[PDB]
Amino acid sequence: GAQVSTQKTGAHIHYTNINYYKDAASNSATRQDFAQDPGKFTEPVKDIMIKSLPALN
Amino acid sequence: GAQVSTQKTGAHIHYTNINYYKDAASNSATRQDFAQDPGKFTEPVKDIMIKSLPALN
Amino acid sequence: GLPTMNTPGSCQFLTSDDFQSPSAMPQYDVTPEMRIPGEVKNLMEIAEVDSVVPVQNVGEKVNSMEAYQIPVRSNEGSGTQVFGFPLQPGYSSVFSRTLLGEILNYYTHWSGSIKLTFMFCGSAMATGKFLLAYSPLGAGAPTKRVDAMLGTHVVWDVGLQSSCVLCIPWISQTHYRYVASDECTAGGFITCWYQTNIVVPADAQSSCYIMCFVSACNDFSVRLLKDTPFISQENFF
Amino acid sequence: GLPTMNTPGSCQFLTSDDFQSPSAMPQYDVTPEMRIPGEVKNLMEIAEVDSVVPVQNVGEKVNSMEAYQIPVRSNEGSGTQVFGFPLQPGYSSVFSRTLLGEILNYYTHWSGSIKLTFMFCGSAMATGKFLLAYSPLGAGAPTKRVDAMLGTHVVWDVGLQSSCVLCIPWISQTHYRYVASDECTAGGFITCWYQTNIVVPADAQSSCYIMCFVSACNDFSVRLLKDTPFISQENFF
Amino acid sequence: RVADTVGTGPTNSEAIPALTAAETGHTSQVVPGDTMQTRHVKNYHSRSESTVENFLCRSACVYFTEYKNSGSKRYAEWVVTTRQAAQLRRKLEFFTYIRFDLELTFVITSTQQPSTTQNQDAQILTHQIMYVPPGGPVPDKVDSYVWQTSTNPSVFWTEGNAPPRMSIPFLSIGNAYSNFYDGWSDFSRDGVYGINTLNSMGTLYARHVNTGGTGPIKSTIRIYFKPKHVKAWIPRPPRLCQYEKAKNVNFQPSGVTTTRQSITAMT
Amino acid sequence: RVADTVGTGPTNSEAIPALTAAETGHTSQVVPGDTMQTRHVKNYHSRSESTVENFLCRSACVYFTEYKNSGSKRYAEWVVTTRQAAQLRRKLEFFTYIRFDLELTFVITSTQQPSTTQNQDAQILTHQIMYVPPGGPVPDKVDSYVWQTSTNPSVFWTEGNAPPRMSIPFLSIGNAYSNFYDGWSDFSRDGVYGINTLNSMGTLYARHVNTGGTGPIKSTIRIYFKPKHVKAWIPRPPRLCQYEKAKNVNFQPSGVTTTRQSITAMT
Amino acid sequence: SITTPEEMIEKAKGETAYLPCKFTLSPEDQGPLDIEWLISQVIILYSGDKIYDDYYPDLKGRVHFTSLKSGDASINVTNLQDIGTYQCKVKKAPGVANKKIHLVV
Amino acid sequence: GYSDRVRSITLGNSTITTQECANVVVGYGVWPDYLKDNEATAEDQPTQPDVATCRFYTLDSVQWQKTSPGWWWKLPDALSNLGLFGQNMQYHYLGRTGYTIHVQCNASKFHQGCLLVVCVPEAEMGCATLDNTPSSAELLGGDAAKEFAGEPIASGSNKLVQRVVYNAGMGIGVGNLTIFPHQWINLRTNNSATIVMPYTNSVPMDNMFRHNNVTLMVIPFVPLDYCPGSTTYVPITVTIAPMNAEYNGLRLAGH
Amino acid sequence: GYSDRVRSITLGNSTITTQECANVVVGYGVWPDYLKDNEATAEDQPTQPDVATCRFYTLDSVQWQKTSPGWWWKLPDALSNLGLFGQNMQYHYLGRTGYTIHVQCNASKFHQGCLLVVCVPEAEM
């Protein structure tokens, strides 16, 4: 029951991971999580402000 | 997810490689790369010079 | 048994390795996660957020709220420089303790643009025009408005809208600049001048202030984590 | 746990092993590669490129540009030897500091042909005929042109084309010769003679010079990497 | 992967991207092409090492204590808390709430203390690291019944072996460790105020299983914490002033920023 | 695999393969059959060990420093640079630009220094190797807060274990390490000139985690660099003269080549 | 790091001799700046952002920094008599560089 | 009919014609081209004059005496003060450009000699004293010969660059230099040599004032020899033409 | 929403922003363009920097006193010594270029005045 994922390589490869301990708190660090959403902190305004349009009409 | 490649043997065999670390900068040395092109340094002239034909006509 | 040989590097401890290790307490039922407003998944999202820049870090003013305000006033002249600082988000003191700069001090290599947002906090009647200008590395910092006119510049005008952003472009030979000072990767010079004069009507103040913010554009990247040089410790607390 | 026994050779360090090792800094975003003119993938491509051979390495001349020039002149005679050197691209001083020879000094076993390219750098009116000749190992180095006439030879004639190549064949009992000196694998003798005389018209120089280049043919191979004996060091710099 | 720039030519229009209103609290999303001319550059750079997980996954010592094999301090007792150190503490503070698993690693080092006892031929030292969960019995002497180990998780490590490493799952009654707590434990609002009131993660005890030899030996144990599977909520400004205490956020007022020569100076 | 020879018989034609023009800069591509008669020999030889990767993949010590456990030099500080050594430096120089990953291996060796303290029964030594990235805080004493390790990559190795080996990914702001730099850091062209100006790879710090024992012990740490995943550009002639300095290419004028007896001598 | 580390400055007796020790710092260098001047023994010291006369009898009150951490550590020795090798050792924890100046007349 | 010797190169508004010439050497096999977007790193819109800068510039002629050891020109520094190529170099911060080197030296049939026209990337050179590096104006020359010296340069408390011809100032065998794109000027057959050099730097663009990527070295391996009665002053004139100039980071002029 | 007053002009590497502005006057109705081949007379390949020269140059400010009669700038002469536009003008013989004039003068609500910003072709004086 081996999980195969791509290795972090340069720009312009696979590695095999098998979970030995059944606790699941012993799993290796989940580094490969490149997900972001700046809307929560940047641009938190209730009404959308198109950058091209004037801000305060 | 094991990669199987031929071993370096004599002239006139397989080995199994599994990438453990996910970083991909920890991979073993890529020795088996026998590719060459002498044109860049040897014979760098813009116009082809056929060896059999006279060089400076 | 399976015949194995231990390669060099075995039985060692590395501060930067991800591996598995038996849990001290097995089958612990962790407390289920909930929804907390504002989860952060990447440090760069925080860098994108605005942060006030203490441009007037002169003398004792770093010990007061006067550090952030940049002073402007109606003077009988034009082309007088308003401020100026090097583009070193990591090393320059102007940027060092800003949210972008302090997070950058936790890394070694940086690349991308910067959104310097200048907010005019003057009176409602004051009308001042300013030449925000960034000079690319290579020559001495501009000493006159005409010298700065050549390099990338935005003629900010004050109206109903207050703030104007000077988006500093990523001009550099190297794909990444060093967060610390280096002659090889000098970021450049950022300066402001008076395009005209901040004229005000009577019975109104002639000494307005301007605040400056810093942020990273959507093309900002960092690499090579290192411990920050700002924190210090003598013994455990 | 999986029952294993450590075979002999475990927990040792080998300077010539390829294995895996945890990265000190994980998930480092390397700087993307670009196109740089002239990527090299094999050392032998560099060996194929021409390199001037200091044939006249006599006395103090190794301390001047006179080391490369080989002197020829119109003398009242024929069969006079012009130069001569053993075929030891690794050990012979003539070849040792040439690009082919110096790269060869980083290896132990060599095999293949050699393109000795002789460029006549004399006047435009000078006409000289030369018997480039390589003698296979076994007998003493030829002392007269008639002795050399027997072994492999090319009667180079000077015209509009200047350079002529003497492609030294790979004659040897062993598939590979030792880069260092050895009685068992003596490479052979390479020599040049005057087929006629370098005749020149009046008001023109009678003392021409000849330069020699060395290169490896497309059937050249090396094996058994070793550290070079030319570099030296006392303490770290 | 980071977003790239898009080409732009000369422009002349009513629309203004630069002029904005920072009063709204929306950081302008202005790309470089908005205020100049820019070429189409494909940026292959990746924000991979700036991830929260990669940011805080480095092993970092939190506390080192030293226990001798013979004398007053036979065993070492340290309450678990990441606030004792500075670098890891500051790293974690960036987020008001944080939920991470732990991978404790212990680096133990012995030292023959200067003495006068002769024929000092000590045998290999053996050490025991015991985690007492909060409310559990705590050892008073180096040889009490508590050291025998009933249910508490303890690791026995002989010296010269690879350093012991036991992973810890998330251990908090709440739904996330609170880095900052603006509250009192007492409803009356009288008593301790701060992070210490809500964060109790147990106590750590380290002792010599065997005395080791005739001569006194002092054993230094260093505890390393590496957050893993980290999820962080509510980012906060980094601690500007130097830490003064472990149980509280008390600080000494410090200059917003290091000063420079003048407002136009470039140093 | 190397190319083989092709058979040839006697020839008599206008075409001349030998006579050429070396002025053009094209090395003649003349096979042995062109100037003689040759048989068809299948050459099974392979240019496998001459590959750039195989050429520079050998582990090679770059610098060894020695730090005592008690005295003036408690810790060792070496700036990372392949120029300190000679063999590996010369190997790398062959290429004007080079892009390689690193696999640092540390060979640490201890030694009981002569002294007069009696009852020297030292416990097993423990060592720490810390890599400070450029711009990072650097330790001043053997026990400063920097040694605790916040985010810098450090390895803890107890003596008698297999030597520590941590791989390093390519670390350069540019697109390739520049072996030669014909430029100044300062636009004015006044200041340091050379490879040192553009190559900063951080600093390496080695210290004794535990003093070890009563008697003084001196620890020699040897650092080995093995380029891997190497790509090289623009081959250059090998350094003929002996190196004199680490930060510059300065040399002492040396004879093109070792002399021989005469122009016809065979020794 | 220091510009032109080996230097031979010859100057006539009676006028101030300018001895440059301009230095450039690497990114790896983040340490307290210790600048020490030696003659052939310690003329001046710079530690903790202060300048030390060091009670040198031959050169007391005649030696001062011309400029500082900016990168200049030059000295204008006044009223020469002093002939010797002046060594300037700017100090950083990763690398410490020294410059030797031979002074004549 | 056809003839290999004759060749005509036209660039910008100035073209050159060589009756006897050897085949052009195209660098490492890569003809210079503008910076592709797959590898760009400067977001500014680059200015490309493409005629104003891409034209044949003729530098100062130098005499080839029978005692002349050699000469070296830092290509970027050489054109720093000539025309718009110099002006735009002074203004812009970043600068990327390919080169079309062409060295002319014509002599009668009765003269003899041989030059090595080779362009060396990253010609980092060594000072006479080992501890210090050479100063600008000693290492660099503006439209200046910067001649090599056969005698080893005396090593004292100075910043004189080693001009030792048998080392080329880089402490390497001068004969082994051939690895770099090179064309020989053997007086007997070819009076001209042309090398088209691609932009060879590790970074996409670099400041030309900050660093000189390539340096044209002319080293006479065989000395000029002539019988009495022939012309005794045969010069070597170098015409370097930039190609595909691309500049970013407009700032105030200077350096 | 929309507003006629606000306007932002970007050219080269320098852009300008005017909160209150009147509609741009596009010359005689012909936006400047490169020399078409139907009417060219110089056979040389023209150099077109298009960023190096096409950028906003800010000249020297002048005071508007209550006694100031007027001012005149010869556009080609004004930029003769500023940047590459000046350098390329000094080098090349022939020169064709369109212009994007922009005059700024901001005053509070309590000031009063009126300028005539007009570009005159062939101002023979």
Residue of F nearest to D158 (CA): F19
Q: How far apart are CA G33 and CA G35, in angstroms?
A: 6
Q: How far apart are CA H154 and CA H162, in angstroms?
A: 9
Q: Of all helices (H) and strands (E), which one includes residue C103?
A: helix C99-104
* Phi, psi for E195 (deg, rounded to 5): -65, -35
Minimal CA separation from H67 to chain D, in Å: 11
C135 vs H94, H210, H252: nearest CB: H252
F191 vs G24, G32, G95: nearest CB: G24
Residue G54 structure tokens: 């060091």
First-to-final CA distance of chain H: 53
Chains B & D: contacts with CB separation below 8 Å: 57
Residue whose C-alpha is closest to residue I57's, from I100, I110, I28: I100
B24 vs A2, A8, A16: nearest CB: A8
Residue whose C-alpha is closest to residue H122's, from H179, H70, H175, H79: H179
Minimal CA separation from E81 to chain I, in Å: 53
> Residue D186's beta-bridge partner residues?
none
Collect all residues of chain D within an 8 Å Cβ-Cβ radius of residue B38: 45, 48-49
Residue D69 structure tokens: 């020039």
Residue whose C-alpha is closest to residue D115's, from D186, D223, D221, D218: D218
Inter-chain CB proximity H189 and D124 less than 8 Å: yes
Minimal CA separation from D69 to chain F, in Å: 11
> Residue H14's beta-bridge partner residues?
H11
Residues H100, H243: contact at Cβ < 8 Å?
A: yes
Which domains, and CATH codes, for chain H? Answer: 7-250 (2.60.120.20)
E53-75 burial, b at 16+ Cβ within 10 Å, e below that, comes to bbbbbbbbbbbbbebbbbeeebb
C-alpha separations of C85 from C54, C70, E191, F168, G51 in Å: 11, 12, 48, 35, 28
Within an 8 Å CB–CB cutoff, is residue I82 touching chain H?
no
Q: Kindly report the three-state secondary structure assignment for every residue of chain H.
A: CCCCCCEEEEECCEEEEECCCCCCECCCCCCCCCCCHHHCCCCECCECCCCCCCCCEECCCEECCCCCCEEEEEHHHHCCCCHHHHHHHHHEEEEEEEEEEEEECCCCCCCEEECEEEEEECCCCCECCCCCCCCCCCCCCCCCCCEEECCCCCCCCCCCECCECCCCCCCECCHHHHHCCEEECCCCCCCEEEEEECCCCCCCCECCCCECCEEEEECCCEEEECCCCCCCCCEEEEEEEEEEEEEEEECCCCC
Residues E110, E217: contact at Cβ < 8 Å?
A: yes
Place of tokens 């699941």: A24
Counting Cβ atoms within 10 Å, is residue D69 exposed (0-12), middle (13-18) or buried (19+)?
Answer: buried
Neighbouring subunits of B (3+ Cβ pairs under 8 A)? A, D, F, H
B52 vs F17, F46, F168: nearest CB: F17
D72-81 burial, b at 16+ Cβ within 10 Å, e below that, comes to bbbeeeeeeb
Residue I67 structure tokens: 């006694």
Inter-chain CB proximity C41 and A37 less than 8 Å: yes
Q: Do chains C and A touch (3 or more CB pairs under 8 A)?
A: yes
Q: How far apart are CA F43 and CA F41, in angstroms?
A: 6
Alpha helices in G1-105 (DSSP H): none
Residue of C nearest to D5 (CA): C3
Inter-chain CB proximity C178 and G25 less than 8 Å: no
Q: How many CB atoms lie within 10 A of CB H31?
A: 13
Neighbouring subunits of C (3+ Cβ pairs under 8 A)? A, D, E, F, G, H, I
Counting Cβ atoms within 10 Å, is residue H243 exposed (0-12), middle (13-18) or buried (19+)?
Answer: buried
Q: How far apart are CA F237 and CA H217, in angstroms?
A: 15
Minimal CA separation from A39 to chain B, in Å: 30
Query: What is the CA A16 to chain-centroid distance, rounded?
Result: 21
Which approach determined this entry? cryo-EM
Can you give the residue ranges of every domain in chain C?
Answer: 1-237
Q: Up-side HSE of residue E97: CA atoms within 13 Å toward CB?
A: 16
H41 vs E32, E38, E41: nearest CB: E41
Q: Do chains B and G touch (3 or more CB pairs under 8 A)?
A: no
Residues 36 to 55 of A: which have CB under 8 A from any I CB?
53-54
Torsion of CA H166, H171, H175, H180, to 10 degrees: -130
* Phi, psi for F95 (deg, rounded to 5): -120, 130
Q: How far apart are CA G21 and CA G89, in angstroms?
A: 9
Residue H208 structure tokens: 């030309």
Q: Do chains D and H touch (3 or more CB pairs under 8 A)?
A: yes
Inter-chain CB proximity F251 and H171 less than 8 Å: yes
Minimal CA separation from F177 to chain C, in Å: 12
Collect all residues of chain D within an 8 Å Cβ-Cβ radius of residue C3: 4-7
Place of tokens 């006892």: E117
Q: How far apart are CA E140 and CA E126, in angstroms?
A: 20
Residue whose C-alpha is closest to residue E28's, from A51, C43, C113, C53: A51
Collect all residues of chain A within an 8 Å Cβ-Cβ radius of residue D28: 8
> Residue A21's beta-bridge partner residues?
none
| Torsion over CA: D100, D101, D102, D106 (sign) | positive
H141-157 burial, b at 16+ Cβ within 10 Å, e below that, comes to bbbbbbbbebebbebeb
Helix, strand, coil content of chain G in percent (nearest 5): 0, 40, 60
Q: How far apart are CA D121 and CA F2, in angstroms?
A: 34
Collect all residues of chain H within an 8 Å Cβ-Cβ radius of residue G6: 129, 131-132, 157
